[model samples]
Each structure stands twice: as structure tokens, then as C-alpha cells.
Target: GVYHREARSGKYKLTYAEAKAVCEFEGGHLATYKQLEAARKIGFHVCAAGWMAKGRVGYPIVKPGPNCGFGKTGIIDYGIRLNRSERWDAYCYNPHAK
Candidate 1:
């Protein structure tokens, strides 16, 4: 058997602590950069920025367009470090045993 990981977005923006609690409440944890990378590999695309583990912020963009970023496509990272108090969407990872 193998474990499966799924990425989900929170309904509302939240602070880092709130994001963590929301993920845990949904049977998962706030996604790490690596986990988010894996999710992107599987077509997990989101335009909205989100809170990541280690006080980072990032989001995936499959399609490049205006208002999405600096016109570059792929995962837009906030340098893997940001203010923990900033409110943003959350990418939660649900890892389950199979």
C-alpha cells in the first residue's frame, strides 16, 4: 500500500496560525514547498497566493497572464519567507494511508 497526498485550498484567507489550525482541522497540515511542488506536478493550479510551511508564501500558475504575477509562469514563490502575520489562502496537504 502507498500513501496518497492531496492538496486543498482553504475557503478564506487566514494568518499562519489560523492556516495551520485549519489544515489540521481538515485532517492534514499546511503544505510545505516540496509538497506543493508535488501537487503542482499533478496539475494543482491556483492563482491565489497561499500560506506555506516555515512562514513561506507561494502559489502555482499553470497559465501565465496579467494580474497573476510578473508575467512568468510556474510556481510563484515569495522567496520561501514572509511575514507570519500576513493573511492569505492556505494550501493544505492531506496524506492518507492506502
Candidate 2:
């Protein structure tokens, strides 16, 4: 299963490097864009922006709403945040998560 996590401070502010570390600590890695989309296809909807591989940043939107994606459905791409230091949540991946 795919995973998503945030800072305990609830700031939802995690730099890309930090997000990678967090996922690694959980025995996973920053999910690839394709991976995130794959999960979204199966109803993985989290209305929070997060870090992904390749310096990408985005969130999933399966339900489509004003708060989510404004009626858009699927992986909501916020585009790659060139500023690697920017903060956001994380979309992690683990094939063996229980």
C-alpha cells in the first residue's frame, strides 16, 4: 500500500529532502508520480500537497471538491516545485506496508 505522512508539528511543511528521509525512516521511499496516480485510481484521495520523486510535488484527488481539486479528478499535479527547500507533506511508498 501507498503511504502519506506529515510532520508531527502539523505544519505540513516538509522540504523535499526531509520528506525523503521521513519515508526512508518508515522503510519506504518518496513515491513516484506514476505510483501516486496508480493509487489514486483506486480511491487514494488525500487533500494535501506532498513531495514525490524527481522533485515533484502534488496530491491525489479522487473525489473532486472545492477544497481538493475544484472538480478535477485524478492525481492533482501542483507541478514540480523547483525550490527544493519548499515545505509540503509527503507521499511515501512501501510494497510491504501492513
Candidate 3:
């Protein structure tokens, strides 16, 4: 899973949208559902991107309940899940996932 430093020093206080924009500018976006779930395992507030459609986004707003990996809040950004190991590698949309 990709790691990110928390903005605990107030030197990097960004709203959810701003954070997403920054990430996108750097060739990324807000954390995905899987990413957020992994992040929560270690304690972090994952923020979702406001630019995506409801069904197209994850984290801070996940679908399905009771079995959802992250808490109801979905606050975590651990990256992507690779294979069936439930291990996080990085977030990426595969062109052939069927």
C-alpha cells in the first residue's frame, strides 16, 4: 500500500477536494475503497475524491454495509489490493478485470 504523511503539523491542511486535486496534479487521485480500508488498519482518515460519480468512487463513501472493509466513515488511504492475498499494492484500474 502507498503511504502518505498525515497533515498533523497544520502545514498541510487541505480540504478533501484540495487534497484530491493535489494528488491528481501529481498523477493520482483520492484513495480508493480498498486503499482506504487498508489505511484504516493503521489509523488514518482517508478522503474520497469529489470529482467522481458515486459508483465510480470509493473511500469516505463506500457501498455495501456490514461487510465493508473500512468503518462506516471509510477514513483510510492504504492504496490498492493486489491478488487474493488481501494485501495492498497500489490503486490502479486494470483494463482487463472483467
- Among these predictions, the greatest TM-score belongs to 2
Ranking by TM-score: 2, 1, 3
Residue pairs clashing in model 3 are 36-76, 46-75, 46-76
lDDT of each residue in 1-98, candidate 1, tens digit only = 11122234534457788777766776666777888777778787777666776767766888776766567778888664436776567777775511
Prediction 1 global C-alpha lDDT = 0.65
Worst lDDT run of 10 residues, candidate 1, spans 1-10
What residue pairs are clashing in model 1? none
Off by over 4 Å in 2: none
Q: What TM-score would every model get versus the actual structure?
A: 0.74, 0.84, 0.31
Better of 2 and 3 by lDDT: 2
Q: What is the overall TM-score of model 1 with all chains considered together? A: 0.74
Global CA lDDT computed for model 3: 0.37
* Candidate 2 lDDT by residue in tens digits, 17-87: 89888888877888888888788777788877678878788777777667677677667777876687877
Supply every candidate's count of residue pairs whose N, Cα or C atoms clash at under 3 angstroms: 0, 1, 3
| C-alpha lDDT (0 to 100) for residue 23 of candidate 3 | 46
Estimate every model's Cα lDDT from 0 to 1: 0.65, 0.79, 0.37
Best by the lDDT measure: 2
List candidate 1 segments past 4 Å from native. 1-12, 80-82
